[PDB]
């Protein structure tokens with residue numbers, strides 16, 4: 381399948397080269413997979429989600445996304461226009477308040493929630509969790525992310541936006557999950573992206589158009605935007621039967637575009653998420 385005039389990041393994930401604008405993907409499109417977006421919530425009523433999104437948990441007075449961040453990330457995973465995996469099921473877990481903040485204790489509870497809640501859902505092709513969040517190093521946050529992964533969920537986490545080594549941030553620094561840096565449309569490391577040996581992969585993160593609250597759209601930047609490209613890619617590849625939740629990060633690294641990015645510090649992988657879709 382071909383989506384013309386796609387957001388640059390979608391086109392990038394299905395291309396060996398920068399500078400194109402059509403997204404190519406197998407029409408299965410992540411059908412039968414599930415992606416949990418652990419964030420500020422998801423505006424499930426947005427036409428872009430087509431009834432495929434729902435809120436399943438909140439730790440606050442409402443499950444509504446009063447911020448937009450979670451809606452944007454969910455859109456990159458699975459919206460019809462802005463998403464990688466256009467037929468996946470999206471589940472919102474609101475661990476971040478409407479200012480975009482959340483206590484680590486709440487974030488940990490949300491990860492444990494997903495590990496259990498997947499057993500309440502129909503995800504025959506597998507389960508992914510996208511975590512566009514983090515703060516300073518915490519062994520307890522990392523352990524929660526490790527448990528979620530161990531339980532059979534493909535965990536994708538943002539590297540962080542500090543232009544620093546991700547070893548000092550969580551859950552970015554948990555080795556067993558998929559830690560995602562950000563690139564731009566010219567194949568440069570995004571100016572803010574964290575780096576380091578713990579990164580597994582890069583995805584598009586500068587100037588990413590997606591859904592927003594109030595039934596709207598906007599372009600924003602961050603490792604938060606790169607992460608859902610990888611989460612959606614994992615769901616897509618799992619639906620195709622090419623990989624599993626436990627092995628998808630490694631498979632994505634195996635099949636990535638190699639050596640295409642500039643300003644990658646010595647010791648950081650030069651790997652850009654790629655669907656290898658061949659019609």
Ligand SMILES: [Ca+2]
Pocket residue numbers: 396397398637640
């Ligand atoms: Ca290339």
Ligand SMILES: [Ca+2]
Pocket residue numbers: 554555556557558559578579580629
């Ligand atoms: Ca890893």
